[PDB]
Amino acid sequence: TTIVGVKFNNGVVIAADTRSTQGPIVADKNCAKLHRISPKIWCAGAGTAADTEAVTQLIGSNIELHSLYTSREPRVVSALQMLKQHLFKYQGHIGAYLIVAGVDPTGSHLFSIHAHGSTDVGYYLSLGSGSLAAMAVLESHWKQDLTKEEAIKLASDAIQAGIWNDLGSGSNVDVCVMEIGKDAEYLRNYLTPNVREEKQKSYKFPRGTTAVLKESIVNICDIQEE
Amino acid sequence: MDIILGIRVQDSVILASSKAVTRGISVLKDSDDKTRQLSPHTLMSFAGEAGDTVQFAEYIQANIQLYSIREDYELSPQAVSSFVRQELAKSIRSRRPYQVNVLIGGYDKKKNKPELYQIDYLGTKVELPYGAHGYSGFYTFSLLDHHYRPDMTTEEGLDLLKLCVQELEKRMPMDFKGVIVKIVDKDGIRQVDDF
Amino acid sequence: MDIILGIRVQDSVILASSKAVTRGISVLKDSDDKTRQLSPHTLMSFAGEAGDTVQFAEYIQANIQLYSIREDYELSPQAVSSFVRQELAKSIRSRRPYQVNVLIGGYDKKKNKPELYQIDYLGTKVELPYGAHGYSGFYTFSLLDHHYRPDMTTEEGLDLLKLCVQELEKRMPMDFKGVIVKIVDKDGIRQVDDF
Amino acid sequence: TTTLAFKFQHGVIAAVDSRASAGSYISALRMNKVIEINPYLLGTMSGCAADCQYWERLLAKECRLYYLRNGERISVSAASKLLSNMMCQYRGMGLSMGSMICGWDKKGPGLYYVDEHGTRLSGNMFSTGSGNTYAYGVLDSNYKWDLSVEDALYLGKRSILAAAHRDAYSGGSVNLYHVTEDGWIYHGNHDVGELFWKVKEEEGSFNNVIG
Amino acid sequence: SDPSSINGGIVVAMTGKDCVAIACDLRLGSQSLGVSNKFEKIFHYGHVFLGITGLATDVTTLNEMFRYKTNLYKLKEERAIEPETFTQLVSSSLYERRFGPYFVGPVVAGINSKSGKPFIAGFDLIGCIDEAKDFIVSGTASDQLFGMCESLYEPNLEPEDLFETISQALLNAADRDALSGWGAVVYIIKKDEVVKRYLKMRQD
Amino acid sequence: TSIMAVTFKDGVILGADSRTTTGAYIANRVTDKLTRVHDKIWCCRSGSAADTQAIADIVQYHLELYTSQYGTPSTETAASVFKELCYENKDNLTAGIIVAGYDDKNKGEVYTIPLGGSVHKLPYAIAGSGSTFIYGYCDKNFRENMSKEETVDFIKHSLSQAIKWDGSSGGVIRMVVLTAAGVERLIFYPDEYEQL
Amino acid sequence: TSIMAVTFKDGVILGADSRTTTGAYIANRVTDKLTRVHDKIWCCRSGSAADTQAIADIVQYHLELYTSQYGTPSTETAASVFKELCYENKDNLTAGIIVAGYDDKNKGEVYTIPLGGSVHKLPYAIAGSGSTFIYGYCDKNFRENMSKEETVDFIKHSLSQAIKWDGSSGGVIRMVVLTAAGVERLIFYPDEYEQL
Amino acid sequence: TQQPIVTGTSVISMKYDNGVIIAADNLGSYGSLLRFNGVERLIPVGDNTVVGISGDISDMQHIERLLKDLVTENAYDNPLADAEEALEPSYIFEYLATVMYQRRSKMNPLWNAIIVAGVQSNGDQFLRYVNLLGVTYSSPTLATGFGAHMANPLLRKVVDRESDIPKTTVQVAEEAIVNAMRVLYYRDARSSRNFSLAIIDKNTGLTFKKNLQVENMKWDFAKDIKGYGTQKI
Amino acid sequence: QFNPYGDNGGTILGIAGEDFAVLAGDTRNITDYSINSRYEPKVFDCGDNIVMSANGFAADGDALVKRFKNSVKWYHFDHNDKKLSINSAARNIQHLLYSRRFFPYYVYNIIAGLDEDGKGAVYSFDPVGSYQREQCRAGGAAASLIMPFLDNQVNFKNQYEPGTNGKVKKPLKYLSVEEVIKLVRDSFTSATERHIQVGDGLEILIVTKDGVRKEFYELKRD
Numbered sequence A: 001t002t003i004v005g006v007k008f009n010n011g012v013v014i015a016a017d018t019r020s021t022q023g024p025i026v027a028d029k030n031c032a033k034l035h036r037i038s039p040k041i042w043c044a045g046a047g048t049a050a051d052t053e054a055v056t057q058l059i060g061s062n063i064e065l066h067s068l069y070t071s072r073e074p075r076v077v078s079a080l081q082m083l084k085q086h087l088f089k090y091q092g093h094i095g096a097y098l099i100v101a102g103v104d105p106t107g108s109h110l111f112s113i114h115a116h117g118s119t120d121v122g123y124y125l126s127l128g129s130g131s132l133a134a135m136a137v138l139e140s141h142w143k144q145d146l147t148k149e150e151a152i153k154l155a156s157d158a159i160q161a162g163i164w165n166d167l168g169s170g171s172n173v174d175v176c177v178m179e180i181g182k183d184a185e186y187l188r189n190y191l192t193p194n195v196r197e198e199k200q201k202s203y204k205f206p207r208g209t210t211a212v213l214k215e216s217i218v219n220i221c222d223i224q225e226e
Numbered sequence B, C: 001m002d003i004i005l006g007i008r009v010q011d012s013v014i015l016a017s018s019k020a021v022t023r024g025i026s027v028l029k030d031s032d033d034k035t036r037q038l039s040p041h042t043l044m045s046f047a048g049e050a051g052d053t054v055q056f057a058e059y060i061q062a063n064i065q066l067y068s069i070r071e072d073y074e075l076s077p078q079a080v081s082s083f084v085r086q087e088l089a090k091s092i093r094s095r096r097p098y099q100v101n102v103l104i105g106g107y108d109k110k111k112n113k114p115e116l117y118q119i120d121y122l123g124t125k126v127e128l129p130y131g132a133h134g135y136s137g138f139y140t141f142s143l144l145d146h147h148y149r150p151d152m153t154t155e156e157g158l159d160l161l162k163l164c165v166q167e168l169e170k171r172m173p174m175d176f177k178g179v180i181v182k183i184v185d186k187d188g189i190r191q192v193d194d195f
Numbered sequence D: 001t002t003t004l005a006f007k008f009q010h011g012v013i014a015a016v017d018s019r020a021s022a023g024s025y026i027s028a029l030r031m032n033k034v035i036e037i038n039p040y041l042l043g044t045m046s047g048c049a050a051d052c053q054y055w056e057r058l059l060a061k062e063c064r065l066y067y068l069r070n071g072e073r074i075s076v077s078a079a080s081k082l083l084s085n086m087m088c089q090y091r092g093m094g095l096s097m098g099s100m101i102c103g104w105d106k107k108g109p110g111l112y113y114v115d116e117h118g119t120r121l122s123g124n125m126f127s128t129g130s131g132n133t134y135a136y137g138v139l140d141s142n143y144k145w146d147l148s149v150e151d152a153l154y155l156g157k158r159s160i161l162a163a164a165h166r167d168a169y170s171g172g173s174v175n176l177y178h179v180t181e182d183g184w185i186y187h188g189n190h191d192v193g194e195l196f197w198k199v200k201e202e203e204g205s206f207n208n209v210i211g
Numbered sequence E: 001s002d003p004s005s006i007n008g009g010i011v012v013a014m015t016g017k018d019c020v021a022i023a024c025d026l027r028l029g030s031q032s033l034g035v036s037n038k039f040e041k042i043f044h045y046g047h048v049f050l051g052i053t054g055l056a057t058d059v060t061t062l063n064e065m066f067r068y069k070t071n072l073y074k075l076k077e078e079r080a081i082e083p084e085t086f087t088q089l090v091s092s093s094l095y096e097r098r099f100g101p102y103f104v105g106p107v108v109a110g111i112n113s114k115s116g117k118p119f120i121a122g123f124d125l126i127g128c129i130d131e132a133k134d135f136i137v138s139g140t141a142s143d144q145l146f147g148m149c150e151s152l153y154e155p156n157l158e159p160e161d162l163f164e165t166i167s168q169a170l171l172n173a174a175d176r177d178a179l180s181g182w183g184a185v186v187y188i189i190k191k192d193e194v195v196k197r198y199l200k201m202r203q204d
Numbered sequence F, G: 001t002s003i004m005a006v007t008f009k010d011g012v013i014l015g016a017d018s019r020t021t022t023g024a025y026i027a028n029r030v031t032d033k034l035t036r037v038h039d040k041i042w043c044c045r046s047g048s049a050a051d052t053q054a055i056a057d058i059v060q061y062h063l064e065l066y067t068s069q070y071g072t073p074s075t076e077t078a079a080s081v082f083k084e085l086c087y088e089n090k091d092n093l094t095a096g097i098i099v100a101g102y103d104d105k106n107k108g109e110v111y112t113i114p115l116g117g118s119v120h121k122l123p124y125a126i127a128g129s130g131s132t133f134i135y136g137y138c139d140k141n142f143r144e145n146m147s148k149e150e151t152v153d154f155i156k157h158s159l160s161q162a163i164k165w166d167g168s169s170g171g172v173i174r175m176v177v178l179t180a181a182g183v184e185r186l187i188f189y190p191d192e193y194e195q196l
Numbered sequence H: 001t002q003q004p005i006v007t008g009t010s011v012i013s014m015k016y017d018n019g020v021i022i023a024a025d026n027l028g029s030y031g032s033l034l035r036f037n038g039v040e041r042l043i044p045v046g047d048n049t050v051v052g053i054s055g056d057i058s059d060m061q062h063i064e065r066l067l068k069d070l071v072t073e074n075a076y077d078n079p080l081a082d083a084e085e086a087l088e089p090s091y092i093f094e095y096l097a098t099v100m101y102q103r104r105s106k107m108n109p110l111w112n113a114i115i116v117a118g119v120q121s122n123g124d125q126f127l128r129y130v131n132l133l134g135v136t137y138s139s140p141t142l143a144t145g146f147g148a149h150m151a152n153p154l155l156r157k158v159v160d161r162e163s164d165i166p167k168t169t170v171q172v173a174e175e176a177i178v179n180a181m182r183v184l185y186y187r188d189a190r191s192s193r194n195f196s197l198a199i200i201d202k203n204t205g206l207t208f209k210k211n212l213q214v215e216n217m218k219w220d221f222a223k224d225i226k227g228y229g230t231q232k233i
Numbered sequence I: 001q002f003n004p005y006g007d008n009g010g011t012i013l014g015i016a017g018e019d020f021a022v023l024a025g026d027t028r029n030i031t032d033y034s035i036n037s038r039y040e041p042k043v044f045d046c047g048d049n050i051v052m053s054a055n056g057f058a059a060d061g062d063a064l065v066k067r068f069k070n071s072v073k074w075y076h077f078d079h080n081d082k083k084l085s086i087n088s089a090a091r092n093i094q095h096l097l098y099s100r101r102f103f104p105y106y107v108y109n110i111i112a113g114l115d116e117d118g119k120g121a122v123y124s125f126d127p128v129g130s131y132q133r134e135q136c137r138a139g140g141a142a143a144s145l146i147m148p149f150l151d152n153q154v155n156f157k158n159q160y161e162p163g164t165n166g167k168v169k170k171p172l173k174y175l176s177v178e179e180v181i182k183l184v185r186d187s188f189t190s191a192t193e194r195h196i197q198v199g200d201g202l203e204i205l206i207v208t209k210d211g212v213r214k215e216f217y218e219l220k221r222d
């Protein structure tokens, strides 16, 4: 994975690539790494994919119940605190490395989270195998007082650096923009620079090519009347 | 222990199990019966780690006998095999798993059919016309693949079984001291005293 | 390989050696002769690691045959055994030692006496009335300790040897496929074709 | 692999499979595991493919030089021993080579088993490789000295089939050879997929398998 | 030693036009030894199909477990479970054993009875969902299946064309894997009819 | 990491670098290692960031609860809570913490809590991987009852040298001044401290 | 061990502690670590005493033979012989050597040869287990073209701190002054340097 | 077999329209200790080649001496040593690559990663990499160690493929290299601010720049960053 | 501890026609998760109408090719400029590989050309020297992805003739160079999608009686 988080004037943006890998093999070419904790709190995960999902769904569930209990909109520090205490408890065995970002009544926030339970604060962050390629871009082009449009550009450029230069990262760019006083906009497949070219040949077979021994109807319906 | 074989013919199931028991470098016994009757028409042979085999078999036996008394009814071989599988699948993730492989030969009185189930210590169940555990299959399955028919008589099943034992006795480095053979059919369980 | 036995009676030396050869889990041969004639009145049986046994035996055989031709004279069993021991004692501190245990049965024509020497792969030589290598002695020495006399005939030696093999066949977990028996006496070396 | 070879009245049969593996991956479907050393000498291959090819082709060099020096074909016994002596030099260095040296010489038909340990065994029947146990089962129950060339060829063919079926690391095709006093005779490549269905129908065997 | 490759096996699923297909080999082994050629790895709970590869005892155990759970779901909900919902149930059930997992590679296939939309999904042994549009692969010949599916597959195939594509993907992948084969089954699934076909293949 | 806390006439000053490494990669070059457990009780963290963050959060919870019941806690009391956590969980922790605080009664105090969970009250303390390189410098240049400006220069010069020689240390030099006047945060950038 | 060599206006001075340890036992508390390979080319040894003694003896042999044939060797030439031995036998050696010498042409020169067998010419060098604790101090206090008395004080203060913090260092401080005037040996006892 | 002791970090390089640029910092690290601060890791060979070396410094000094001796040996009985039969970048590289692969084949490697940058007789740009395993490759941009992970992505934005080389000027290429060196100083814990840069142009020849510093650094934003999550002060 | 081996990724593919042969390989060179080069040629014209590619550990691959090219040169010197036939080259390479039986060239080697009857030939090797002539072979990282596809599309495996239902196989009709190049490009495009070490570029060397011809095709760079 390559994932980034970038703060700007009136909010925060996160982005991610869309490749998932089983060693050197690409399992999914269009994976969704941008997860929702609450409507305006989104996280992006690297490391063990099942862990990033499970831990995100769990904290998102508890955040929702907390929000209902307190009659308040959830805060990013709450998600942060709940995540790190959960991860710390399992001593790195839950391999979830997350970038957590969001907007709440306190303002806009951007945190990184490691599997052992350590958290960091920043204006720009990167995680995953392509973090170094992405950080090179962020360190080159990031500045204070970015606009929304500049931050999305910087974020997607950082992901692209990972896509092209890191073998663990590839395919498309997903983005989520969280601006203060607005609904969060999830931009699934914001960029699509890796469309497979047309194949030279069609491998559609003649009907009857495959040898068959037996045929049978499968009863999927329930037991019938009469 | 080592070799346990099983074959399902037309109207019966035949189980052959070795007689040897070895401690250290000494063969302590050459007449050991590696089997337990679970019910009148269900027989289970077993092989695996020392001690665990008999303890597991007797534990299964007690549970099936308890069921029989409670319901005044004999469980089908399929039901017994599923119960045994679950116990082994439960066991493999325990603190100390029971290292036991079993064959369950039964005659289903409802369907009037013989049934042979092969279950390993992991809880891997398969219904088969003939089966074995450990290295036994490496020597015997080629013979069984060649000679086996589903309409075989009990006598033909025994002759094919003799050929399997003869091959084992020729090509195994291991002296397993012959086999005790038992037949499971509609009339129940009986032992072939001359083999 | 596994079992090699030796017994020195009144007027001869009898060597019994197993016939089995095993690769992996398969017995490749059940008629292997684990012995080499070093000279007309000297026989050496051997057991140890695969390959090393025959290579060592044939190397010894070549050296003794070379000596016989050079001097037009047969070395005494004692001289041959000492030569073999030195080669093994030389071998144990080599880069890759020859993992071979041997029995040397010979009839000394000068002294008119049978002689049995037991030598292990370390070069540990002992002259004995009866001997064995590996686990063979664990089963057989109690019988030999009980029944052995030095004035036994060749026929009585064979009968006591049969009893040793029967005990091995009963209490060893290992099927060694019977033994080839050879007799060394004043008239030379001959094989007992029915045993 | 599965290989076998056996002596009989009319010479020696040699049958091998053709599969090659690299873990669970089938790297080759059709590999020649027999080497034609000379018109009267064959060599089967089991173990490391490189070791089998290099050393048996080097054996053929040495067997050819024997003919030039002595004006006479090398015996099966001598050829098998040259090979076993090569194995004894690289003793413990990690070679993996199980082979049967089959041929016809003055003593009649000859068959020797030789492995990487320097083992050299004379015998009427041998089988090597991961599937040798399955082949032995069919061989032991059906082998006679009084076999006809036709029935003997089928036995070696059927014995490999047995192994190819059960052993995961044996299959592809069957290569048959028949060694006579006029030399060896190649009896073709037989796809196991096709052979299996054919044998199932004609013989009635493999009843448990559905087709 | 590796639990995911002791017994061997493969499962592949594909989407087509208003249809899905799921297929599996029939082999069960003990490493090199072939034990059964009738070990089907595809199960169905109503109209939702589940293929499971990996350790056979866990395959059997999970089938029994999801049968258990889908039967209770149906009694309480008064309707059959849908593929999307079942996929989450599989994921939840696998992750509850995060630190003592079932050594399996499940594959879900089915058609939503309400929307009519074809659905397939794959998981790792601990629940991570891979909701692919095109195809899902699992087993000891997953690398082989990826190569075949990626080259042979094209979108919006009709049921009888999809059958040929998935069959050839499985067959040729299995023939390059020692631990897969010994027969094969293909399920062709439409909104209200399901056909099951046993393929003829080499038995080595 | 390079961290230190120094007592002086008017109170105490905590100082730290801002580099966090994962091997040779700098995961964060603007880390804040000076963490607040109470209004005028701060700590410097070294070792496992997960462990030290988890500890400081628990300590902050204890001192917040202490305050609700018994009023403002002493710096010694804060160091005791750190110690109790670090000592009883020494088998599962890798934390080297310096505790520093200001009372009106006790004035500026510094406690260091190394790996084992022992506590040591000192006039000044240094810790972290970069501290090794400035033991000689700090010993030679430290004086008791320095002025604020002298103490700031002492920490700045010391951490400058630690950063210079230790690859695991670097970035900016953060400082926190604890006096009766209040809490003052300071920051010093590379171009300032590198030319010292 | 704590060793250093410092160039100054009139030449160069080598300095060292005198402690040799076998674990925590002090096997020798009056060791002479300043060893002569030529009249005005000396070295400071750190690491395996067996290895560094064997090397210095071989080097002394080479430079004695060099002198017989080609006249007085340079300090660079001496450092090259050390290097060649330390580099080519790096797998079987644990030697950290500082080479220091005086020419009339080149004046005072210092070369350090760490574990790998690399060579580094420097104005001054520090090495040994105790050197870690004085990197900051030595960097801050070193100046080029110091006087003899300034350089002696610099080494004395530096090694005093190394000894203070390093348990593997201690005893007396030995020094060797290399100038045109000749070769002067110095010694400083604990009661002198401890109170600095 | 050994382990590296005193080490040099990234060496970065790229092709441009008329030549090549190569750069490397002046640091010699001793584990986490930033021990030596005046180490030159770019070593010119003649006026047409610069060899940039990372990894073990003692092995670098050995290689430096091999190259110095290579120039000496090439001049022997060679009237055209400063002309047609002068050392080329490709000769120097292949020599080093031969040595590296031989040493790894004796299980006694030179623990280095080397980039040979230069301009050939015909004006062609030469840029090739070799390491302790004897592995060799060429690319429009090359970098060792951390530079591979952080510099290449930045340099490949300028020269993404072969056709971008004639479009890239020396000012743009140098600017990209200098920016990359700053990024490495931000993010590589075993790097230094001081570095050397060499340009080998087919027209202007070899320009060797020493005592360069990373400048225009962004640190101000650090003042605003407080705590690790919930802390406000 | 020093590991003398490495993995530079890549994948190669050799297909033999009736009167031609192709040897294709991707141009990407990698270590771990980094790209070294997007264009680093891997398939070489070794002379005498023979093409060669040693895939796996690049250093050992370059050394082997370099040695074989050298062997061809010395074959001309020693045997009166005689042409080295493809079968003779294959046997020669076996001995080059086995010379290192106990410290192997860690590469999967393929050579392609024409036999002495003018027909297309491909030979496949393992790291230690075992070789064989084949009609079709993929080697390297994505070999397991590509080979089953070639079994299906080149040798028509598991393909039967409609209407017969498994009774009659698909006949083994020969493939043209244009048809082969399509299978090569689709093989690598598919491998590039699902294998992270495969991509950037594809270089194909086609061998005919007329000589050796090259064709280059772009691949995805992610």
Ligand SMILES: *[C@@](C)(CO)[C@](*)(O)[C@H](Cc1ccccc1)NC(=O)[C@H](Cc1ccc(OC)cc1)NC(=O)[C@@H](C)NC(=O)CN1CCOCC1
Pocket: A001, A002, A019, A020, A021, A022, A023, A027, A031, A032, A033, A045, A046, A047, A048, A049, A050, A052, A095, A128, A129, A168, A169, E124, E125, E126, E128
């Ligand atoms: C890039 C690929 C690498 O960092 C990125 O982090 C993605 C993150 C991600 C997040 C959500 C969805 C998809 C992808 N990670 C992966 O793609 C990981 C790679 C990985 C493999 C194995 C791991 O165990 C050490 C950790 C990470 N993929 C997966 O986790 C997924 C494919 N599962 C598996 O491969 C099976 N795992 C299950 C846990 O045991 C190990 C094998």
Ligand SMILES: *[C@@](C)(CO)[C@](*)(O)[C@H](Cc1ccccc1)NC(=O)[C@H](Cc1ccc(OC)cc1)NC(=O)[C@@H](C)NC(=O)CN1CCOCC1
Pocket: D001, D002, D019, D020, D021, D022, D023, D027, D028, D031, D032, D033, D045, D046, D047, D048, D049, D050, D052, D053, D096, D129, D130, D169, D170, I124, I125, I126, I130, I131, I132
């Ligand atoms: C069966 C298939 C496996 O036990 C049999 O032993 C064959 C024997 C054999 C003999 C001559 C030629 C081909 C095959 N053995 C193999 O296939 C071996 C098995 C093996 C794997 C790994 C080993 O290392 C411990 C030892 C043995 N396989 C190989 O030798 C394999 C590594 N080589 C190849 O597949 C070489 N081929 C691949 C296709 O291109 C040509 C070269």
Ligand SMILES: [Mg+2]
Pocket: C118, C119, C120, C124, C125, C126
């Ligand atoms: Mg003895």
Ligand SMILES: [Mg+2]
Pocket: D163, D164, D165, D166, D167, D168, D169, D170, D171, E203, E204
């Ligand atoms: Mg098979």
Ligand SMILES: [Mg+2]
Pocket: G048, G050, G051, G092, G093, G094
């Ligand atoms: Mg020493």
Ligand SMILES: [Mg+2]
Pocket: G163, G164, G165, G166, G167, G168, G169, G170
């Ligand atoms: Mg001291």
Ligand SMILES: [Mg+2]
Pocket: A162, A163, A164, A165, A166, A167, A168, A169, A170, I221, I222
């Ligand atoms: Mg990528």
